[PDB]
């Protein structure tokens, strides 16, 4: 339960399958709802049970409340620590775009990665997680643009 970024694995497919990404901070595990659908996770000989979730936000916490409070300044560059299945975590610097909605605007990263990359954190220059990656749209060019999904602590 040490802090850091973790892979969400499952043997329910043909074998070892990475279904998404997750961030452990302050003893709470943060991933996206669509990755686990609230399913309980194994951390060795111990299990982690869901504590909070919201299908609309596509987020879910484990072992406690959501702890990530950092927000993108809407100005500076940020880094997506992508964790693709079977690939070493790589920091990808980028400048977030804007998802213009009726309830306001949110940052978006125009990076395309395998489906199993859902949940990889997005960092600010200070090292604070400002959101999760994996919930977005597909633009004209067939591109993928994921929103910078962040919850409320």
């Amino acid at each position: 339960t040490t802090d850091g970024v973790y892979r969400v694995m499952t043997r329910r497919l043909l074998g070892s399958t990475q279904v998404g990404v997750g961030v452990m901070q302050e003893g709470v595990f943060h991933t996206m709802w669509h990755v686990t659908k609230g399913a309980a996770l194994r951390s060795g000989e111990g299990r982690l049970d869901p504590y909070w979730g919201d299908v609309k936000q596509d987020l879910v916490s484990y072992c406690g409340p959501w702890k990530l409070d950092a927000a993108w300044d809407g100005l500076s560059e940020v880094q997506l620590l992508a964790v693709p299945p079977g690939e070493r975590a790589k920091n990808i610097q980028t400048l977030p775009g804007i998802f213009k909605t009726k309830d306001g605007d949110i940052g978006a990263v125009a990076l395309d990665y395998p489906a199993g990359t859902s949940g990889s954190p997005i960092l600010d220059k200070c090292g604070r997680v400002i959101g999760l990656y994996g919930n977005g749209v597909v633009i004209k060019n067939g591109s993928y643009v994921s929103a910078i999904t962040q919850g409320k602590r």
Binding site: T10, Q93, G127, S143
Partner: protein, 38 residues
Amino acid sequence: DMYIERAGDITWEKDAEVTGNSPRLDVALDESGDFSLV
């Protein structure tokens, strides 16, 4: 049943690749948590 495996630390890497654009899109978020291009 699923299990987690540690993938690294949450740190900013000075020698990181810089790529990806910064689109500005009007999007709708339905009750099911899916984004839609509007």
